[PDB]
Design an enzyme around this catalytic site. Sequence first.
Site, PDB file in Angstrom:
ATOM      1  N   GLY A  28     -50.703 -79.799 -59.939  1.00 49.84           N
ATOM      2  CA  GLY A  28     -51.154 -78.783 -59.174  1.00 49.84           C
ATOM      3  C   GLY A  28     -50.854 -77.475 -59.555  1.00 49.84           C
ATOM      4  O   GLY A  28     -49.602 -77.601 -60.085  1.00 49.84           O
ATOM      5  N   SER A  29     -51.254 -76.406 -59.321  1.00 50.62           N
ATOM      6  CA  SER A  29     -50.721 -75.046 -59.564  1.00 50.62           C
ATOM      7  C   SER A  29     -51.454 -74.079 -58.625  1.00 50.62           C
ATOM      8  O   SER A  29     -52.638 -74.031 -58.115  1.00 50.62           O
ATOM      9  CB  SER A  29     -50.952 -74.651 -61.113  1.00 50.62           C
ATOM     10  OG  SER A  29     -52.370 -74.868 -61.409  1.00 50.62           O
ATOM     11  N   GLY A  30     -50.476 -73.097 -58.263  1.00 52.78           N
ATOM     12  CA  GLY A  30     -51.265 -71.893 -57.222  1.00 52.78           C
ATOM     13  C   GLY A  30     -50.996 -70.712 -58.181  1.00 52.78           C
ATOM     14  O   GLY A  30     -50.970 -70.904 -59.636  1.00 52.78           O
ATOM     15  N   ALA A  31     -50.868 -69.420 -57.671  1.00 52.62           N
ATOM     16  CA  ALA A  31     -50.646 -68.182 -58.235  1.00 52.62           C
ATOM     17  C   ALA A  31     -49.228 -67.833 -58.520  1.00 52.62           C
ATOM     18  O   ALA A  31     -48.568 -67.033 -59.087  1.00 52.62           O
ATOM     19  CB  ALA A  31     -51.190 -67.039 -57.276  1.00 52.62           C
ATOM     20  N   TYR A  32     -48.298 -68.755 -57.881  1.00 54.99           N
ATOM     21  CA  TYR A  32     -46.705 -68.395 -57.895  1.00 54.99           C
ATOM     22  C   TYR A  32     -46.126 -69.698 -58.661  1.00 54.99           C
ATOM     23  O   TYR A  32     -44.926 -69.926 -58.602  1.00 54.99           O
ATOM     24  CB  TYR A  32     -46.261 -68.142 -56.454  1.00 54.99           C
ATOM     25  CG  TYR A  32     -46.249 -66.983 -56.161  1.00 54.99           C
ATOM     26  CD1 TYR A  32     -47.517 -66.015 -55.558  1.00 54.99           C
ATOM     27  CD2 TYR A  32     -45.138 -66.053 -56.184  1.00 54.99           C
ATOM     28  CE1 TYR A  32     -47.430 -64.977 -55.168  1.00 54.99           C
ATOM     29  CE2 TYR A  32     -45.056 -64.686 -55.831  1.00 54.99           C
ATOM     30  CZ  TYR A  32     -46.237 -63.964 -55.304  1.00 54.99           C
ATOM     31  OH  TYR A  32     -46.023 -62.823 -54.930  1.00 54.99           O
ATOM     32  N   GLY A  33     -46.819 -70.710 -59.104  1.00 56.78           N
ATOM     33  CA  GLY A  33     -46.322 -71.583 -59.514  1.00 56.78           C
ATOM     34  C   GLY A  33     -47.129 -72.860 -59.971  1.00 56.78           C
ATOM     35  O   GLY A  33     -48.465 -73.327 -59.497  1.00 56.78           O
ATOM     36  N   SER A  34     -46.585 -73.844 -60.629  1.00 60.12           N
ATOM     37  CA  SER A  34     -47.006 -74.985 -61.406  1.00 60.12           C
ATOM     38  C   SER A  34     -46.333 -76.171 -60.985  1.00 60.12           C
ATOM     39  O   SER A  34     -45.278 -76.140 -61.501  1.00 60.12           O
ATOM     40  CB  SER A  34     -47.428 -74.788 -62.695  1.00 60.12           C
ATOM     41  OG  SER A  34     -47.993 -73.786 -63.167  1.00 60.12           O
ATOM     42  N   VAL A  35     -46.819 -77.171 -60.414  1.00 61.16           N
ATOM     43  CA  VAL A  35     -45.937 -78.502 -60.397  1.00 61.16           C
ATOM     44  C   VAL A  35     -46.201 -79.549 -61.262  1.00 61.16           C
ATOM     45  O   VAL A  35     -47.599 -79.606 -61.592  1.00 61.16           O
ATOM     46  CB  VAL A  35     -46.110 -78.927 -58.924  1.00 61.16           C
ATOM     47  CG1 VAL A  35     -45.041 -80.311 -58.572  1.00 61.16           C
ATOM     48  CG2 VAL A  35     -45.685 -77.852 -58.000  1.00 61.16           C
ATOM     49  N   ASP A 165     -41.893 -75.308 -47.106  1.00 61.45           N
ATOM     50  CA  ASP A 165     -41.694 -73.839 -46.669  1.00 61.45           C
ATOM     51  C   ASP A 165     -42.893 -72.955 -47.503  1.00 61.45           C
ATOM     52  O   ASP A 165     -43.212 -71.909 -47.084  1.00 61.45           O
ATOM     53  CB  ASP A 165     -40.592 -73.407 -46.582  1.00 61.45           C
ATOM     54  CG  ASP A 165     -39.869 -73.902 -45.416  1.00 61.45           C
ATOM     55  OD1 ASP A 165     -39.333 -75.006 -45.428  1.00 61.45           O
ATOM     56  OD2 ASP A 165     -39.926 -73.299 -44.171  1.00 61.45           O
TER      57      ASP A 165
END
Length: 341
Positions: A28-35, A165
């Site tokens: 997964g990934s958002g605008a503030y990171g990637s897992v 969080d």
Amino acid sequence: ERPTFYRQELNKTIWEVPERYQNLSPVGSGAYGSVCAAFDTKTGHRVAVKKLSRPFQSIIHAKRTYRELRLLKHMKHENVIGLLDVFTPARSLEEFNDVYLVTHLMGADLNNIVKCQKLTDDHVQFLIYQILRGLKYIHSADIIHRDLKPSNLAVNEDCELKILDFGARHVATRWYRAPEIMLNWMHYNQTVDIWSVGCIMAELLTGRTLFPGTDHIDQLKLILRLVGTPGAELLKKISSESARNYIQSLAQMPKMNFANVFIGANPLAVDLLEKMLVLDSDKRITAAQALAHAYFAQYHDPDDEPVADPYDQSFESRDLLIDEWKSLTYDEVISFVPPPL
Ligand SMILES: CCOCn1oc(=O)c(-c2ccc(F)cc2)c1-c1ccnc(Oc2ccccc2O)n1
């Protein structure tokens, strides 16, 4: 010691991590990171590795890296996400520009584990108890989640739950939001997280989102229709003229019969919900209070519900420049000390 790294592109992003972790698989990934999921060869474990997107792209970006690293370093509770590791490939402050965070891979979120929905009273009890248990800890540190929602809960196939969080899909935030924080209020409180917990609970017992507004205006309409229009007392606590009107301007919503809406389920569940979904944050039950309640009789144990060590978040007030946030962060990377087996 100082580990050796290897780079690779987990599409379309580049990852620079110690050889310790293998089989990097995007999750997964958002605008503030990637897992990425991965295997910790040291401990033989499966872990989640988060690469922050551009930690220091801006002041706003800089302080939030910092905020994140600082809370994660503080959180030590089984119901809250913490750090197994934190690293950077850089070798000096000079080249610092990437941050990686390591924790226990959970592999799914509440959503991801719960659909198609409506589970036994028994699983609901357990899921919510873990959430109230991790929230007890977090609040006890003088921290407000404010973003509590299904996608912010990490659950494994053993149904064990951790609060994250910072962390959406692959949930619709305002569905879980305390009314007070959809009104510009306040000197409001911790109990906003209690509203969301109520909202999640409703949907688990019910199989359907409680308050699926289409916007903040709609959202409030649906909230009001369940909980009713506000007492004159609550009214007097509202300074916001525009807030007062929007409210004061509605169908005079009668407080609905919980029993009837909720749902054929455990009357304890409903009486708890009754206590969590209150318009007045001042009157909303607390994490700890909620834990000592009849609904969780079989899970509740008062000497296994720890609270946190005090957390300094005085940084939140400050306004520093990118470099200061950046070196702050680095310092915390440097000083991190790993958990014990
Ligand atoms: C990608 C969706 O959610 C990712 N979630 O946000 C984060 O930010 C981290 C995160 C990772 C490392 C870290 F150090 C801190 C947080 C994780 C995280 C933490 C632990 N386990 C998992 O596994 C999941 C995999 C897919 C879906 C949901 C999951 O819970 N994710």
